[PDB]
């Protein structure tokens, strides 16, 4: 199975209106195409084909149903799966993965239309497996990488500033062990909320200590499911550092790009080992994990170069061949 790649374009924001930008992106969900006007105010265009394309009016629940549900079914069959969010800062990586609370409304978080992939997925795991006849346990962890240092965001009994260490898994060699990373047992929906709420608070604190934390950090959220025979499924959701930090500094972003390139061009040495991120997610790039990428872009003319760079990177990635296998 090739890595599945989809593109999500967000609506114009106000900064873009204030810069007097115009729209240079057209999404065609039916043909699964996105075309970008490369000229200026018609003049030339590039068209890319992806596995799916979501336009500016795409709702959170549409992304979840079309992209994540099929993947969650594989996880429950006992596969490992990974979804990346990739793209320029401000294009919707975090909105897609986590979402938001609807403002002047109350919804419970379980029913809030702005909820993203993670809340929905966690809600549905308990929902599906309870109805199934059950016999399952769920644990979650959240690690962030900033300037090639690992932080555990979910450990309540720990300062956010304490970094973790990693070493290779003796008996895996294609995965690593992260010393001290808390894998927290989640007993139900309500506990999910309080656990991740503390995580959000620690993030806030980390941002006061580190420059441009939210745009330069990589976030890896993992949920592991044990089911009584299924048996063991794992889902990794990765919110990557803003893609403008490279293009055409951030060692993990850099190496991820080289790993993609090496895999597509079939070069002999794939440099997994040159960054924390690619060491952690090695099995997701050319391994036995089923992987999807969500590439987020801006519609606006002033982001032309970053949008093209994102679409080129995403387009190449879908040539990577994975070979999924159940745990
Ligand atoms: C419906 C809804 C959606 C999102 C939020 C929210 O803003 N949050 C904090 C900041 C978001 N960047 C939430 C949040 N935090 N968080 C830290 C790391 C990660 Cl990963 C997440 C994440 O996935 N969420 C979403 C979530 C997850 C489970 C249940 C409900 C919402 C926070 C209240 C929990 C609050 C309510
Ligand atoms: N599809 C979308 N529709 C409406 N608003 C969006 C969409 N994607 C992102 N936004 C908003 O744009 C801003 C930045 O999104 P964000 O997820 O933080 O970007 P990123 O994580 O890639 O830096 C926030 O206001 C966010 O809610
Ligand atoms: Mg973000
Ligand atoms: Mg980040």
């Amino acid at each position: 199975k090739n890595i599945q790649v989809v593109v999500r374009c967000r609506p114009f924001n106000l900064a873009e209106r204030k810069a007097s930008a115009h729209s240079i992106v057209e999404c065609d969900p039916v043909r699964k195409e996105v075309s970008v006007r490369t000229g200026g105010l018609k003049s030339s265009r590039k068209t890319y084909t992806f596995d799916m394309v979501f336009g500016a009016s795409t709702k959170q629940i549409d992304v979840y149903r079309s992209v994540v549900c099929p993947i969650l079914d594989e996880v429950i069959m006992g596969y490992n799966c990974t979804i990346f969010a990739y793209g320029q800062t401000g294009t919707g990586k975090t909105f897609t993965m986590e979402g938001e609370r609807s403002p002047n409304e109350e919804y419970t978080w379980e029913e809030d239309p702005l909820a993203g992939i993670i809340p929905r997925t966690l809600h549905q795991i308990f929902e599906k497996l309870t109805d199934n006849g059950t016999e399952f346990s769920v644990k979650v962890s959240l690690l962030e990488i900033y300037n090639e240092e690992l932080f555990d965001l979910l450990n309540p009994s720990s300062d956010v500033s304490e970094r973790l260490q990693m070493f290779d898994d003796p008996r895996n060699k294609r995965g690593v062990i992260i010393k001290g990373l808390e894998e927290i047992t989640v007993h139900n929906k309500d506990e999910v909320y309080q656990i991740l709420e503390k995580g959000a608070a620690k993030r806030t604190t980390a941002a006061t200590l580190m420059n441009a934390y939210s745009s330069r950090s990589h976030s890896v959220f993992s949920v592991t499911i044990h089911m009584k025979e299924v048996k063991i499924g794992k889902l990794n959701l990765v919110d990557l550092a803003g893609s403008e930090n490279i293009g055409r500094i951030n060692q993990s972003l850099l190496t991820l790009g080289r790993v993609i390139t090496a895999l597509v061009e079939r070069t002999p040495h794939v440099p997994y080992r040159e960054s924390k991120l690619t060491r952690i997610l090695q099995d997701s790039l050319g391994g036995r994990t089923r992987t999807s990428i969500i590439a987020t872009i801006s519609p606006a003319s002033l982001n032309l170069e970053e949008t093209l760079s994102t679409l080129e990177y995403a387009h190449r990635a879908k040539n990577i061949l994975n070979k999924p296998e159940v745990n």
Side-chain angles (χ1 to χ4, degrees), residues 105 107-122:
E105 311 248 41
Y107 293 93
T108 59
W109 65 263
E110 300 88 342
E111 68 186 18
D112 194 318
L114 298 189
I117 289 179
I118 284 166
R120 292 175 192 275
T121 293
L122 291 177

Side-chain angles (χ1 to χ4, degrees), residues 213-227 231:
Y213 182 75
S214 65
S215 65
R216 296 190 190 165
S217 66
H218 305 271
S219 184
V220 183
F221 180 90
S222 293
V223 53
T224 303
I225 307 171
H226 292 246
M227 298 156 284
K231 196 63 76 188

Side-chain angles (χ1 to χ4, degrees), residues 5-9 50 84-87 91 293-297 310-311 314:
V5 184
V6 310
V7 175
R8 190 186 187 180
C9 190
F50 292 95
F84 294 91
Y86 179 100
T91 56
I293 299 177
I294 302 174
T296 58
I297 63 180
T310 292
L311 295 176

Side-chain angles (χ1 to χ4, degrees), residues 61-105 107-164 166-170 172 175-197 199-227 231-247 250-272 274-321:
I61 191 166
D62 299 328
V63 172
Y64 180 72
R65 286 168 173 159
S66 300
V67 179
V68 183
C69 277
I71 291 180
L72 184 56
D73 284 345
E74 293 260 300
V75 170
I76 288 180
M77 290 190 308
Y79 282 98
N80 296 320
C81 299
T82 297
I83 302 177
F84 294 91
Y86 179 100
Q88 171 182 27
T89 293
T91 56
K93 292 185 295 300
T94 296
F95 176 72
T96 300
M97 284 294 170
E98 309 182 8
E100 286 167 23
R101 188 189 324 282
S102 297
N104 299 275
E105 311 248 41
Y107 293 93
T108 59
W109 65 263
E110 300 88 342
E111 68 186 18
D112 194 318
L114 298 189
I117 289 179
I118 284 166
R120 292 175 192 275
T121 293
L122 291 177
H123 182 243
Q124 287 311 123
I125 288 176
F126 286 109
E127 180 127 307
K128 292 171 75 73
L129 290 182
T130 293
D131 296 344
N132 251 19
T134 312
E135 215 61 353
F136 70 100
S137 60
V138 179
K139 44 201 178 76
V140 300
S141 59
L142 178 61
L143 87 72
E144 313 231 315
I145 299 170
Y146 178 84
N147 192 24
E148 283 314 278
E149 318 224 77
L150 286 47
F151 305 86
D152 182 343
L153 271 287
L154 246 41
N155 192 354
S157 310
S158 175
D159 174 39
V160 61
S161 183
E162 301 184 36
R163 24 269 255 292
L164 315 179
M166 67 167 45
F167 55 88
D168 297 345
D169 205 296
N172 209 82
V176 300
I177 298 179
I178 301 181
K179 257 166 304 196
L181 176 70
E182 300 308 323
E183 296 184 297
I184 302 177
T185 290
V186 178
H187 297 287
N188 52 56
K189 152 248 273 61
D190 298 311
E191 183 158 47
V192 166
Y193 185 90
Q194 76 155 54
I195 293 171
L196 286 183
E197 180 177 50
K202 287 185 74 172
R203 262 190 192 157
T204 298
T205 298
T208 67
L209 312 183
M210 286 158 286
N211 189 221
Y213 182 75
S214 65
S215 65
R216 296 190 190 165
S217 66
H218 305 271
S219 184
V220 183
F221 180 90
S222 293
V223 53
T224 303
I225 307 171
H226 292 246
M227 298 156 284
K231 196 63 76 188
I232 302 184
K234 184 173 197 186
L235 176 61
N236 306 116
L237 304 160
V238 183
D239 183 355
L240 293 168
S243 63
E244 69 281 2
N245 290 312
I246 57 179
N250 200 308
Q251 179 65 13
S252 278
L253 232 206
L254 231 300
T255 305
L256 175 61
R258 294 166 171 167
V259 167
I260 298 301
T261 293
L263 285 169
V264 171
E265 292 176 354
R266 305 183 70 262
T267 67
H269 168 75
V270 184
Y272 299 110
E274 302 186 10
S275 79
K276 304 293 182 63
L277 179 71
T278 49
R279 283 181 72 193
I280 296 169
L281 302 173
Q282 176 171 167
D283 199 52
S284 296
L285 294 327
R288 295 179 145 92
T289 298
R290 175 179 165 172
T291 297
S292 295
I293 299 177
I294 302 174
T296 58
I297 63 180
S298 159
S301 58
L302 79 166
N303 292 122
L304 208 205
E305 300 305 338
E306 288 308 336
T307 292
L308 286 181
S309 174
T310 292
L311 295 176
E312 288 292 334
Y313 256 86
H315 188 77
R316 273 146 72 204
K318 70 177 205 158
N319 291 320
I320 300 184
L321 193 285

